[PDB]
Amino acid sequence: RIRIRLKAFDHRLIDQATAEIVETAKRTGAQVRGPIPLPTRKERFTVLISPHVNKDARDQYEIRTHLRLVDIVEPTEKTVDALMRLDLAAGVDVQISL
């Protein structure tokens, strides 16, 4: 009944947060759906390499945005109390929709 979707710039870091969230859900006792990997978004940029001419020589960059979703289904009164500020990770977005 509440969806937690996690966004990060590296897969290994996003796994650290999704691993505890099911553990906390397992600590609630049961009834976790399991993290599901949504499709990844990748923005590719192409900036020129020189301060001047030689336009034909460029550099291509890319930023990825890995995605997860756990889909908490049973909202215990102790689930809501315990699921605030327990991500233990910096640089990971959190979004909870009721």
């Binding site: 590296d10 940029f45 900036v47 020129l48 301060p51 291509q60 890319e62």
Partner: protein, 100 residues
């Protein structure tokens, strides 16, 4: 880049949020099919009385570290050269070299 030009951008920013976040009715509200008397003709005439600094039309959107007018990138806010100088060093998170 020529600090004179950098001062223009913030003078045009200051007069952009000052007026055209509130004085937008003349160009948006009084433009459509409504009372067609001189009040619309007043709206057209009164829109020029405001200083020349309109919201979109006079913002060059230059770089934040050098003020380079060209090669801008809206996402990072730097030019095409400072992005590679705020570099692959690691200043920009999650931005690596692409190979597909």
């Amino acid at each position: 880049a020529k600090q004179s030009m950098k001062a223009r951008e913030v003078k045009r920013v200051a007069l952009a949020d000052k007026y055209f976040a509130k004085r937008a009715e003349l160009k948006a509200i009084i433009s459509d099919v409504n009372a067609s008397d001189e009040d619309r003709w007043n709206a057209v005439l009164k829109l020029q009385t405001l200083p020349r600094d309109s919201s979109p039309s006079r913002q060059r959107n230059r770089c934040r570290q050098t003020g380079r007018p060209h090669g801008f990138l809206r996402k990072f806010g730097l030019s095409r050269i400072k992005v590679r100088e705020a570099a692959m060093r690691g200043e920009i998170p999650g931005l690596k070299k692409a190979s597909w």
